[PDB]
Design a protein around this ligand. Structure first.
Ligand SMILES: NS(=O)(=O)c1cccnc1Nc1cccc(C(F)(F)F)c1
Ligand SMILES: NS(=O)(=O)c1cccnc1Nc1cccc(C(F)(F)F)c1
Ligand code: NI
Lengths: 230, 233, 229, 242
């Protein structure tokens, strides 16, 4: 069984896949025919991922991954390699506290990315896609700027191996967090005048994972209905 | 992904990136109207569409004139329907040229908006210039900045009607323009591109295809760079 | 020190323009301020005099080639070549385009003089924060790009071109916004206060100086930390 | 008797890291010229002593001190020493550095920890005064080379914008200066062909002087720049490189 202009037979790793945007990315990739490995930081979350994938007919697995630790990352990859193959699509979705958070997130992004690159180097093919945070404002803006820069820098480091690195900057998305006066205030700031759906973020990620986006790298695609806050 | 039963207008469709956008949209099932500034170009567009099985038309359009624009839309409306996907593809040229081009973008966009307002649906996608000295670069950078800003502003003006407005900033693409830059200048550019290769016209078309889709309904005001990792400010 | 330099400031009869006029005068330039009416031009002259600034009030309409050309030759004749020019002048599409034509028109006119001198300063003042967002953001992007492009075109002649992007400044426009809307804006500004006109003038003053000779094509935001793209 | 001085930073204490040569030294001398008491720092005793002798030769009141921005103990001790002998530093220029595979990540993130560390330490003093100036100097201008340069610049801009938001309400401004191609002892010794190559990229068609960076810093330290915060002022003669 051999494939053409699809994600068929590709193994995709999606962190933070148990709810909201991560779950939708997991499902969209599966719908495009990838083998999807979703991760959570707990056993119960990893089980819910496996059951969700199964209910949507997606071949894959739920796994426990803690992106903040080198041992958890190394072990998880060797497990995946042994059972399923090398993951060549990797989606990193997992006031005055802004510095630590952003730094921590970037260490995890780096750590995971560096681990999965040996595989992708070997294949001369890969996709790394980073999901930024949903829309206090100081943290949002710092996060976004660190994510853009990180994505642009890593893209440069791994371009020559035919690995794209890209990011998706979501705006105001309908997730369990965001679900009145404050709600109407936000809708006034969004040109389309509506919240985004999780699936709308997934669609962009799906496209970036495809062969049609092979010349796109280092980019951050904002998916925010026209609300730009930097 | 499906654009079935949608009418799409692509300006500058006779070669290179425009042609590929015309064919990709057709491949996704849109009725494609391609335009050129001459009758012979417009006829080549019709023959190219036919050879790829794409229903559509070749038409003569001069984006710089109100009469040409108004007439062309009426002709399209009469024969095919409202276009709801529209792809816009001597001193101090960094000012005059650029500002003239933004008037064309604006002129065309304003003309096709009545149709999209009526439908409560639309896609406007602007294609910026390909990379291709000293006189060169000031113009290139002014064009790119004007396109981003224009796109962001218009997206705001027409958001509430469920019309997205976006732009694609290509990098170094393999087209007839760029094949005939001197080899030294070509090799210089390859050194600056992380993927270490020229982009294909089809790679631009794919992005446009996605932006035209329902999957990109929450993307507006954006400029998607498609440049293999080469970024220029 | 801007001593022995002639500086042209458009829109100098109130608010930010007036303050730029006074600051430049305070640094020792001869200041020519402009307004679109004779009574405004007279008020400029009386203001300059009350602050001990040598200069003039003048009627200028930046939107017309005849008004621009005539005004420069009148200045050249009486005072010398203006080598510091502050453009504080001038549905979103037409407006922004019009403003950029005025910028261009005036800049091109005063470049001959600066080329001759092998020295010059052009400083563009963008709009203050008051559909509302759309015009502001388009204006700002057109100003940055324009400034960046012209800086490239006139760099080799030792002319700098820069821009100042003000945030929420205390001027006659913003004095008339309802207190609830005012307090809302103050929440979005880190320094938690409106800016003064003089604070804009201080930046322009520095940009006009010799100390800023290596700064060109820049846009300096003066917005107390409130940033919008 | 006793000479009062009429200058724009008179009676302010200014800390400048990495002050023993190049841009740091020039910032130290410019701030002194504007009348501040200047404390310059180096990572060694012999560097700190050269700073003192330089300040003295230019008639600047101040001190050379040993500081290692990468360590909390060195930072804390140095501030208390300064507060004890000279007063609270209310102008702080971060011009000390970092480096000692992926340097575009590790180096950059380490430097931003130093910036944050130092900035947090000097904020108590500035909070107390209801006044302060923090100014960060970015790096002066291969393929890997350019990756580092662009990451550094983007991190510095974002950092500066974020900290400005955190400390605005206390009347502390936080700003950055992004230098371009500045003239230094390394660049004076490049062959003319390599020199001319660089000058082609720069509209003003000339290298910048260290003093030209210092002038911008001097202005940002002033009361005239009280409404400017969160900004990065590029001082690159028009060469805009990302
Ligand atoms: N070196 S990198 O790839 O991680 C990177 C590349 C580009 C820009 N920033 C980067 N890092 C960064 C680290 C901590 C805080 C921030 C801040 F949010 F303050 F802006 C940014
Ligand atoms: N050619 S130029 O120097 O004036 C110029 C240089 C750089 C960017 N924009 C420019 N012009 C411009 C003209 C009309 C509308 C806009 C818009 F605001 F929509 F982005 C921009
Ligand atoms: Ni006369």
């Amino acid at each position: 069984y051999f494939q053409s202009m699809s994600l068929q037979g590709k193994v995709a790793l999606v962190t933070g896949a148990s709810r909201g945007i991560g779950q939708a990315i997991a499902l969209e990739l599966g719908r495009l025919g990838a083998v999807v490995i979703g991760t959570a930081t707990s056993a119960s979350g990893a089980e819910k991922i496996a059951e969700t994938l199964k209910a949507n007919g997606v071949e894959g697995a739920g796994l426990v991954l803690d992106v903040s630790s080198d041992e958890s990352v190394a072990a998880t990859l060797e497990h995946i390699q042994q059972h399923l193959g090398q993951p060549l699509i990797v989606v990193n979705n997992a006031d005055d506290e802004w510095f630590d958070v952003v730094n921590t997130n970037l260490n995890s992004l780096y750590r995971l990315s560096k681990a999965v690159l040996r595989g992708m180097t070997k294949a001369r093919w890969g996709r790394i896609i980073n999901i930024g945070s949903v829309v206090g404002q100081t943290n949002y803006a710092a996060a976004k700027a660190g994510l853009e820069g990180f994505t642009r820098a890593l893209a440069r480091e791994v371009g020559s191996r035919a690995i794209t690195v890209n990011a998706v900057a979501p705006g105001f998305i309908d997730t369990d967090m965001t679900r009145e006066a404050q709600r109407e205030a936000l809708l006034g700031q969004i040109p389309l005048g509506r919240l985004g759906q999780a699936e709308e973020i997934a669609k962009v990620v799906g496209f970036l994972a495809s062969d049609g986006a092979a010349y796109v790298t280092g980019a951050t695609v904002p998916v925010n209905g026209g609300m730009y806050m930097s």
